[PDB]
Copies of this chain bind each other. A is one copy, B any other.
Amino acid sequence: QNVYIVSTARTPIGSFQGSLSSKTAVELGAVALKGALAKVPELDASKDFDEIIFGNVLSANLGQAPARQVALAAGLSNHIVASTVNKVAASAMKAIILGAQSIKCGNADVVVAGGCESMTNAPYYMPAARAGAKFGQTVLVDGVERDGLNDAYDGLAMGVHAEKCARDWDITREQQDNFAIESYQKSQKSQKEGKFDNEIVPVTIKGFRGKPDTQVTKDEEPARLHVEKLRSARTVFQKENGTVTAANASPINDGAAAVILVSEKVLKEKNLKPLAIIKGWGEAAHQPADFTWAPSLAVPKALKHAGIEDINSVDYFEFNEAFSVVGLVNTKILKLDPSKVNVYGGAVALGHPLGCSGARVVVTLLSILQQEGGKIGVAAICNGGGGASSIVIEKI
């Protein structure tokens, strides 16, 4: 059975310890979901939503069942079936895939998919607290690092594996900086031309002691571009002869995104306007250290599953820019036209809230197909552990 997207929304993406600091991951998820629900008042929040599957990586200190909290906070009925999924950066795309599968199987007719992350408010852990440290120093671990940014097998940061990708595929410092700059320039242009306006819903920030309430309305990172400081930035993952910098890597970020999926049956009954159809998807994996070019494996699977014979049939691509090297390497391997890829800018400039980005790219991709006259789009996102997820959608 066909699976349609009828609504999408996302919060603006906040910087680490930035504009969305006062909000939890669940709260941000609620904002995005309320934004999406408001677009489809045909669907009754009190009755028509069968299931929620929501992405989140850093669940520590969020409380029981983050997807359940998001749904209830958004005003959805408590009869909703809820579950939270973690595929690191792929989490929210996996939520969409799983939601699509549920509709295809006839277990649900209306599914909420998406993801949320507050990397700001992910806590520190004390492993030795329960049993005791006994004697000598002990460590407080940054959860962002342990469960989000470091490889589980060698303990190294994803950025170190980005440096591996640079060596393996011959991608230079200067190539990565150029990609980064363009990502920022495209993101800034898109902001100025209102390209994100339909997809973003603002976050209300409560006023502090006589201060008025404010709205966070735009992504925080794009305005931070400083070309000269970017081009001379220190390499943070490898000191000597490095290529990856804080400027050309994606930042640490807070955000959420929501997508509403329905079956053909509901689309009819409810007189909903379909925005796009999920044509298919593909997921692949290989060596954990090679996660950066895993999307190159996933995309052909997605295309085959979608019944797309020629990759040139695809009008636009979204490759989540976990690093500038990720954007470059997959375009290179697949021999794609760069002008069709991340045309509004990507994660290097927009930000990368891990649990959100898998859906965020789909949301932005749909906006691109809608606003730039595209029919077929592909979204792919790599993930820590050596994997990637990819999805094909077609605008209606």
How far apart sit A88 and B84, CA to CA, in the bound complex (Å)?
A: 9
How far apart sit A121 and B125, CA to CA, in the bound complex (Å)?
A: 11
Task: Determine how close the nearest CB of chain B comes to the CB of A80; give it in whole angstroms.
Answer: 6
Chain A 62-86 residues near chain B, CB threshold 8 A:
62-69, 72, 78-86
Q: Which of B67, B142, B384 contacts A64 (CB 8 A)?
A: B384
Chain A 32-51 residues near chain B, CB threshold 8 A:
none
In the complex, chain B residues whose CB is within 8 Å of the CB of A283: 81
Task: Determine how close the nearest CB of chain B comes to the CB of A353; give it in whole angstroms.
Answer: 16
Chain A 91-148 residues near chain B, CB threshold 8 A:
91, 94, 98, 101-102, 104-105, 107, 120-148
Task: Determine how close the nearest CB of chain B comes to the CB of A351; give it in whole angstroms.
Answer: 16
A334 CB-CB contact with B under 8 Å:
no
Q: Which of B17, B60, B140, B152 contacts A69 (CB 8 A)?
A: B152
Structural contact, A64 and B101, CB atoms closer than 8 A: no
Q: Which of B59, B78, B386 contacts A285 (CB 8 A)?
A: B78
In the complex, chain B residues whose CB is within 8 Å of the CB of A141: 61, 123, 137
User: Taking beta carbons and an 8 Å cutoff, which residues of A are in contact with B?
Assistant: 16-17, 21, 59-69, 72, 78-88, 90-91, 94, 98, 101-102, 104-105, 107, 120-148, 150-153, 252, 281, 283-288, 305, 383-387
Q: Top 10 A-B pairs ranked by shortest CB distance?
A: A132-B132, A63-B152, A124-B129, A68-B385, A60-B60, A123-B125, A65-B385, A84-B86, A64-B152, A64-B384
A-B contact pairs, 21 of them (CB 8 A): A16-B135, A59-B147, A61-B127, A62-B147, A64-B148, A64-B384, A64-B385, A65-B87, A65-B385, A67-B86, A68-B288, A81-B387, A83-B94, A101-B102, A101-B107, A105-B105, A125-B126, A129-B140, A130-B142, A133-B142, A135-B252
